[PDB]
Structures are given as structure tokens and as C-alpha cells.
Design a protein around this ligand. Structure first.
Ligand code: NDP
Ligand code: NDP
Ligand code: NDP
Lengths: 288, 288, 288, 289
């Protein structure tokens, strides 16, 4: 059937590409040049936002729930009953539930579907998806997830965003702690390369030490794939998840504050892994 | 040639078993019944501590450098020139360098060779070894490491212990943060099983979420393989490493304090993963 | 002119008494018994909630903004233009700003006016008031604050609540840090009494070391004046203040988590200063 | 006749030795000797080469760290006479100071750690608080010579004074920084820092930091230089050593050392300790005033 994608960003562009190669796909983006470019590259069709309502399934991958609200309100007058809204934005659980209630007024079923895998996973089409919403709706949308591999239904609306936020909080902690430790080792003469060869074959290994630090930090490449400002935004959502019960969570709480320092020192558009540059700055040595 | 192993503990017993099946091996343990048991099971030879001096390579896997010192002093009169001392204890860099100096007076070459892989890695014989010491000595001992797989030379004496401490600090942080995050998700109705299925296929994954939490926490098994007290001891050594330059290290500094709380609440002989029981206690819910 | 006071708790009862001495005063309490008692003691007049709208100045001293909202909704149909609402509740800045906007629709000017000084200060009529609101409105209500001594205009609506929350957050940090410090000194043999004599005459002094620890901890008296659960609640409001700009605030964020630990270990009913009992438990020694 | 001597005429030492100079015949020495000469002209002390310091019955030192105390002790070692007292006002290390005490004992010299609190203003007023560590007999003998102090407390054996000083400064650090985080948040939402402090200083959250440092140095934008940020970090380092004794859970104090290290790395060790708040203003994009 016909699907539509809104938000052709670092993640949305490649994600919509997989959709375009499997289904008749309509695409829209605020900066429309991206939509025209996408049409030429993948066979999708660039359309005015209003036409997105023609789709059986509408996909969004925007910065925050705030922007998803914006596009939903713009489409509200045209939305048709029986339509599904798959939101791949790393959004806010509560605001998303309110959005789902609003969409139901038009017979549109909303599901939070944030993802993990980065731009490389998006390009490969192997993104892990954490779905939140009705089981019946989940079954209906699974076949349309052409850009994913592992798809997990984690609960009702909002549960997906909650799991994504916590996942990113763990990534943040793992990455920053590794930075602190490696900086200390490098300063006393240990090869960062050697330290990681050991760590990645030991109990302290994480996706951060295995697939981010060696490739982006040791190489000094620091490619831009996920804005530091967006990671801080996710950490903020994670704090919201922690506020539910407010059980003692000193480590994750501190994580939000340290990444905020990095954001203030390096800027929101720096890559998230560049947060380690702050440690290098204070340390007076590069993790190299 | 002859090798000898001192300290048949959770790690030492299986480690010495690999040596016993490759080389003529002598074994000794403070609680001697363990040595007699080892001899019966692996074909090693239980001997008085003094006879360990007959070995070309002496291995130790004790609690701390303090105990390595105790054993070394007891052996001083018997140590023979040309002997190698491979210390698999998760020891202190500085104290080990001092010990290496005094052993060098007897013609004994000390190498810090701490390991990672846990009791399961020790049983399989796939331990990762991080060696600190002279290049020539490293090449001489490699063939005797029958309980290892990945063996990395990370620097001079003490460097091995330094890397191990940092590796364990990363494990500690990764593990606790995961606990804080999963606790929050569980309290709002999300299955830890589901959350981990997502996380272990996402960017927040780590050895802690992949191989410790599902196996020990979700199952409620909490097997005893690595004492919480020893992990706190390792964290203490890591803080010594951070003290070298004293670059801002908020996350790792906090990690030592939270695990200390767990130790004081649960006892030093609880398994290190049981630290998460403190979070379950505060949260009033089990991580499942 | 006529005034009305809502909420005759440990703070409100004496506060309304000071008002009764100067102006015709109407009083209301969730439970009538207290209002009748007040009338019989001060000459105020106990009335049904509806009559409170007859006053020129309405005062509220309730548990939280939630209750202030409840009373506001009940009085809304009766509120008259040109009326002032002075809220002495330790409320939430944001929710209170929304309330002020709602009340403005009725020509009612809301001013947040939390107090410090406790029951002793309320009884003596020497409370310190931190006012948030328009300059002209502040000048208008100053002469009505019969229960106060120091009255300070700290900013726009919400600023009073914000200062109250931050103040208690600082009290929390100062008290806990002092505990960690004193615990270490006591463990190594230093007299808690002598340590405090020095500190209280030195740069590290605070109201906590000066008027709380020596009188309540060293003596083991631990009198109940401000519940630990209430301090945690105020710390929560403080985190909300922090959330406005989200500038790096590691110390204050950590403070909320450590007091939450105390609350979960000792219970909400324990006095706030008893939080140090948790440190005593871990340290294995009393701060005395 | 009996004389006293002071080594290290710094921010603290200069005025401290001034109080001694107007009270007893005092010999003074400073690495940068021009400082010693100026002191003689200003207080009536006698600037002399380091060797003459051993002529004193009581020798005072107020140097950066125990390290400098050590090298000055070695230089004087061959001249030290039995029966002399060494009053060390340096904010030093407990353990290193104990070894120094043993070493000095070889010459019949009695060491006492006597770190102080009160800042340069307290030093000038002669109202410093002193925390003594050492033998009761020695303490009683030195009390009458502490002309720059008001409150004097014997807290224990050698090293105990330095320990209490380190913890005191750790508390100051936490109090000052937390107030900064809180004030930064308040100013950002339209709250008057001046008025907020008036309330806080009349409430439970008050501390010496909010009462006598922030209003006078930050709100005014004056940021006078009286106590180097680098030295405060050094003190926090010593405080961490005190926490290492038992290693009971101490999250707040541990974190305090890390945040001030950040400030030191960003602003430099020679900035004033209170300038650490400039880092918060930097991140906040607003000044606390
Ligand atoms: N990058 C990564 O590695 C991962 C990111 N995510 C999450 O995916 C989401 C998007 O991230 P990413 O693709 O990197 O983001 P980018 O910044 O690359 O793209 C953001 C997209 O949102 C659009 N947008 C922004 N504001 C508006 C608006 N007001 N109205 C309409 N469209 C708007 C942009 O349009 P325009 O082109 O006009 O600017 C752009 O298409 C975020 O929630 C992020 O946290 C999840 C997993 C991984
Ligand atoms: N367990 C794990 O998962 C891992 C542990 N390590 C490190 O390995 C080292 C040992 O750990 P683990 O095997 O779990 O320890 P255990 O507590 O199981 O064993 C400790 C061993 O040291 C011996 N020992 C203790 N005190 C003395 C002494 N005074 N003189 C002589 N021998 C003594 C014990 O003898 P006895 O039988 O008489 O008590 C025992 O053989 C530690 O440094 C630990 O941090 C490293 C990686 C993994
Ligand atoms: N400032 C304050 O508010 C307080 C400081 N303290 C403690 O007092 C001690 C001194 O602080 P402060 O007075 O501010 O320090 P300053 O940096 O102002 O002065 C340090 C003094 O030590 C001397 N000095 C430095 N290195 C050497 C050396 N290698 N050999 C001989 N003399 C040396 C200096 O000599 P020169 O003139 O040649 O440079 C100077 O007289 C520190 O331990 C500090 O932590 C305690 C309470 C308060």
C-alpha cells in the first residue's frame, strides 16, 4: 500500500529510502530540497505535506515530539480514518500519549517507534525498533518497517519512547565513563589502541568501546552522525522516565549534567561522540 | 618445563587446571584441601609452598598485592635465578613495581598479568590477559598461558594492573547504570526481558547487559562467581589510576562510592552483580 | 480591610492569628474543628470556603500547589476583581505561574509568598517572606503580612517558590556534605565536638553545622521539626527549578538522590536531619 | 633573647607575620626577598637569610604545600637547635607531615600542624581560627605565640590539624559551588540574585559562602584575589585522602573535587577560588548578580 515519510534527516533520509524501494512512497521535508533529492535517488515521490494524508501509514522522524505535534496539527484537517502514524522520533512518553488521543479523534492510530542503530544502521536497513501501542496495530505495521531488522513490542503508547530514552542514557554513560578511564590510561603511557584491544575482549566492553571510540576518536575522524544536542535531549527524556518513581539513580542523573557541560562547551551540532573532546581538553592529551 | 600455581580460588582453581593439562604443574593453596582436590581432578601435584621454587614459571591469583607480598616473602630464600613470576592477581601498580624490584634481586622476573573473563572464561580457558613487563619476558611466558586466548602486552610492570582496574571500573559503571535504568522501566510496567531484548540489539548494549543481567538478575539466580568486596577493591585501584593526573572523572569517582554502599548493605561476599539488589530494595520491585 | 486565611496547620494557625490581631479575619480549614478553635482563640470568624471571596486579601498555607489549585477551582465562581491572593505554600513555580494566569481572568492578583522560620517563627510572627509578583502588588500587600519580619521581593510570580525550593536544596547539600566530612574525621579519632568547634569558626561553616548537627546529632536528640519526606519533596521542586534552563548542576542533582536513599532507608516520617543516620550506619560509627 | 621567625610571606604569611612582628622580636624570610625587606619596613620584623631562622624558639611556616615545608626543613636541618618548635600553618598533608615531625624530632624540634581559616581578611585582623595537631605539652607552649589567631583548638596528634582543615575546605567548596548552581538557576528565570541571597542568608540554606563570599565577590563582579583556586583544589585533594581512610560512601565530597578540578583547568590555578563560579556563569550564559 501507499506510505509517506515526514522528516528526511540524517535518519529519515535513509529510512525513507528503504520504504521507497518496497512501497509506493510519498516524502516531505521542511527544507524541500531534501525531498526532491530523495525522489531522484530512491523513486519516492516528493509531495506537499497535505498529500501525506493519502497514505495508509505515515512515518515521522523529527527532532522532538514538539515538531511531531506541529506536523500533526497541520495534517489534522486531512487525516483519514484507518490510517496509522508510526513515529520514529525519539519522543516524550507523556506528550506522545496525548498526541495519540488527539489522533484517535480522526481514526488514526499512533504508535511510538523510535530506533537504534545510527546512520549506518539506517543505511543498511537493520535498525532495531521499539514499538509502543496496541498489539493489533503492531501486527498491522510490522510489514511496513522496511528499514528495520529487530522489532520489539515493548508496551502501550509511550513505552517505546521510554525504552529508547533509557537505552540512550546507557550509551551516554558507557561512552563517557570509557572516556574518563582511557584518558587516565593514555596520560600514564598506555596505548589507547592497546587498552581498547584489551577492554573489547574483557568485561568492561560496550558498544561504545567496540564501535564508537576506536572508529571515531582514535582516528580523530569524529564524523557527524548524531548531534550532541539530540543526545542531551534524549538524556532529558530519560530523566523524565526516572522521575516516574524517583528511585535513587545517581549515575544516570549525573550523566545528564556532564553531557550538558559538553553541549555548552562544544555546541549542540557537534557529534555526540565529540563529548569526549571535553575530557581531552581538560586532560591535555588526546585519546589516541 | 615445570610451572607452579599459588592461589586455587574461584579463578585460580580452573586456571591451574589448564596449566596442569599442558605442563607438569605444581599447586599450592593456603587451605590445602583445595590443592589435594585439584591434584585428584587435573593431574597437578599438590606440594608444600617451598617446592613452588622448582618451577620455571610461578603463577599467583590472590585477593590483593598484599597477599602476593606475603607469599613472595615466604619464598624469597628458595627462589631460583631465571624464574618468572606471572601475577594474575588484580593488583596495585605501584606496590607491584616495588615487588618486581625486590624479586629482581633474586633473579626472578615479575610480570603483572591480571585477567578478564570471569569464572566461565577461566573454566573455558579463554581469559583475556593484559601483561605488564619486559618485552623479552612477555615472549617467554606467552606459551605458558594455557588458560588464555587474547593476550596483550600493554606496557612495563604495573601497566597490566592499571588496565585491569580501569576495565573493571567500566564494568562497574555499565552494570549499575543499567540497573538504574531497568529499575525505572520495570516500575512503569516494561518487562526487563523486553527492554534488554531491545537494548542488547541497540547502542546502549554492554557486556553487563548482554552477559550478566539476563543470566543472573532476570533469572533470580545470582550465582556467586566474583565477590562484591573484590570489585570494590578493584574500584579502589582504579581511583589510584585516576589520581595520576586527576583529570575530571565524575562518573568513575561516583561509581566507587555507590558500589561501596552496596558492599556495606549486602556484605563483601555477595556476588558483584548482587549490587543491583540494593536498587531493587529501594525500588520495591525485582528486575524481571 | 478584610482578610481571609485558608489552611490552619502548624504554620497557618499561628499565622492567621497574627492577622486576626490586626484585621477582621475569616478563616477556613479542611477540618472545621481547627477553624472553630481559631475563632474562639483569636476572634477570627470560621466560614464556609465560599465566604473567603469576601476578603480583599486571601491567604493560603496548604501542603502543595495541588491543594491550592483545588481551593482556587472551588472559589473561582466567587472571586471578585481587585482581590489579592497571597500563597504561603511551598509551591511549584511553573504550576503557580499557570495559576496566577487563571486567577488574572477574575481580576485576582496572585503572589507567591513562601516563608522560612518554621513553627517557632510563625508563633512569634517573625517569619521571613520571599515574595514573587508585580512591584505594585507587592507594595500593596506588605502591610498585611502581620506574621512576618523580613519581607523580600525576589522577582516575578514564581520567584518566591523558586527561592524557597533552592534554599532547602542548599540546606540539604550543606547538611549531607558536613555529614560525610564529620564521619571521616570521627572515624580517624577526631572529636566531633572539636571538629565542629573549629568548622563553625571557619570558612566551611553553615547553618547546618552551626544550628543543626551539634544540637541534634551529637546529642542523639534528633528532634522532629521538618520531616525527611518533606525535604525530599522540596528537593523535587528544586529539581524542577533546575529543569528551567538545565545548566550543569551536578551537586544539587546528586543531593536529591542521596536524600531519596535516606528516605527509602529511614522512612518519610524521620526528621530531615536523621538523614545522617544513614551515613552513620555505613560508617559504623555515630557522629558524636 | 627569645625570638620567633616566619617563613613564607604570602597572601596569608605576610599579614600573619605582621601580627607576630608587633608582638615579639621577629625574624622573617621569603624566597622573593624583596617581600621580606618590605615586611621589615612595614611591621618592624627583621628580614634575614634563611639560616638565621634557626635562631628562633618558635619557627612558623605558611607555604603552598607540605612539599615546600619539606625542602625548607631540609635547608634548615643542620642549623636547628634542640628545644625549638615548628608551627606549620601550611594546609598540609597528614601523613607527609607526620614523617616530617619524626625527621625534625631528630634535632629536638617539635612539629605541630597549625593550619588556619579566616582568609586574608582574618589574617589582617588577627582573628584566624587555628586547628592544632600535636602533643598537649607543645600546644600549651605555643598558644601564647599565636598572635594572629582568635579561636584556637587542639584537635589531636600530628596530622589531625591538617585533616580537619582539609575537610573544612571541602565543606566550603561544596557550599560555595552548590550555591552557585542554585543561584545560576534562579537568575536565569528572572530572580534577583541579591534579593535571593538576602532571603537565603536569613534562612536554613545560609553558609559562610552565601554570607561572606558570593555577595561581596560575585554580585559585585569584583572577584578579588585572596585564595588561589589551585590551592583549594590541592586542599580538596588532601580531603580525598582523609576520605580514603575509611572510604565510607561520600558521593558529594568526591564529586566536589572533580568539579573544582574542571574550574581549575578552565580558569587556571591562579584565579581566585570564588572565580570557580565563573565556570557556571560561562555555561549558564548569564552573570550571577
Ligand atoms: N542520528 C542518530 O544516530 C539517531 C537519531 N535518532 C532520533 O531521530 C530523530 C531525528 O534525528 P536525526 O535524523 O539525526 O535529525 P536531523 O537533525 O538530521 O533531522 C531532523 C529532521 O527533522 C526535521 N525538522 C526539524 N524541525 C522541523 C520542523 N519544525 N518542522 C518539520 N520538520 C522539522 C528536519 O528538517 P530540515 O531538513 O528542514 O532541517 C529534518 O528532516 C531524533 O529524535 C533523534 O534523537 C534515533 C536514533 C539514532
Ligand atoms: N572472580 C572473578 O570473576 C575474577 C577475579 N579476578 C581477580 O582474581 C583474584 C582472585 O579472585 P578470586 O579467585 O575470585 O578469589 P577467591 O576469594 O575465590 O580466592 C582467593 C584465593 O587467594 C587465596 N588467599 C587469600 N588470602 C591468602 C593469604 N593470606 N595467603 C595465601 N593465599 C591467600 C585463597 O586461599 P584459600 O582457599 O585458603 O582461602 C584463594 O586461593 C582477585 O585479585 C580478583 O579481583 C579477576 C578476574 C575475574
Ligand atoms: N589564601 C587563603 O585564603 C588561605 C590559604 N591557606 C593556606 O596557606 C598556605 C599559603 O597560602 P597563600 O598564603 O595564599 O599563598 P601564596 O601563594 O600567597 O604564598 C605562598 C608563599 O610560599 C612561598 N613559596 C612558594 N614556593 C616556595 C618554595 N619552593 N620555597 C620557599 N617558599 C616558597 C612564596 O614565596 P614567594 O613570595 O617567593 O613566591 C610565598 O611566600 C596554603 O597551604 C594555603 O592553602 C589557608 C587559609 C586561607
Amino acid at each position: 500500500e501507499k506510505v509517506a515519510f515526514i522528516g528526511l534527516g540524517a535518519m529519515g533520509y535513509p529510512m525513507a529510502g528503504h520504504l521507497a524501494r518496497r512501497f509506493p512512497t510519498l516524502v516531505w521535508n521542511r527544507t524541500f530540497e531534501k525531498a526532491l533529492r530523495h525522489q531522484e535517488e530512491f523513486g519516492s515521490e516528493a509531495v506537499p505535506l497535505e498529500r501525506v494524508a493519502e497514505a495508509r501509514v505515515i512515518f515521522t522522524c523529527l527532532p522532538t515530539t514538539r515538531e511531531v505535534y506541529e506536523v500533526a496539527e497541520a495534517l489534522y484537517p486531512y487525516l483519514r480514518e484507518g490510517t496509522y502514524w508510526v513515529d520514529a522520533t525519539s519522543g516524550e512518553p507523556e506528550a506522545s500519549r496525548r498526541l495519540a488521543e488527539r489522533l484517535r479523534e480522526k481514526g488514526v492510530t499512533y504508535l511510538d517507534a523510535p530506533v537504534s542503530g545510527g546512520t549506518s544502521g539506517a543505511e543498511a536497513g537493520t535498525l532495531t525498533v521499539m514499538l509502543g501501542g496496541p498489539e493489533e496495530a503492531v501486527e498491522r505495521v510490522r510489514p511496513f518497517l522496511a528499514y528495520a531488522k529487530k522489532v520489539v513490542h515493548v508496551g502501550p503508547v509511550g513505552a517505546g519512547h521510554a525504552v529508547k530514552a533509557i537505552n540512550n542514557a546507557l550509551l551516554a554513560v558507557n561512552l563517557w565513563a570509557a572516556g574518563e578511564g582511557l584518558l587516565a590510561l593514555v596520560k600514564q603511557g598506555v596505548s589507547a589502541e592497546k587498552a581498547l584491544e584489551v577492554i573489547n575482549a574483557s568485561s568492561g566492553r560496550s558498544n561504545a568501546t567496540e564501535n564508537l571510540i576506536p572508529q571515531r576518536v582514535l582516528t580523530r575522524a569524529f564524523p557527524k552522525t548524531f548531534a550532541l544536542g539530540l543526545l542531551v535531549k534524549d538524556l532529558g527524556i530519560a530523566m523524565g522516565v526516572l522521575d516516574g518513581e524517583k528511585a535513587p539513580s545517581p549515575l544516570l542523573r549525573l550523566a545528564r549534567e556532564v553531557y550538558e557541560m559538553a553541549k555548552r562547551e562544544l555546541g549542540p551540532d557537534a557529534d555526540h561522540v565529540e563529548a569526549l573532546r571535553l575530557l581531552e581538553r581538560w586532560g591535555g592529551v588526546e585519546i589516541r
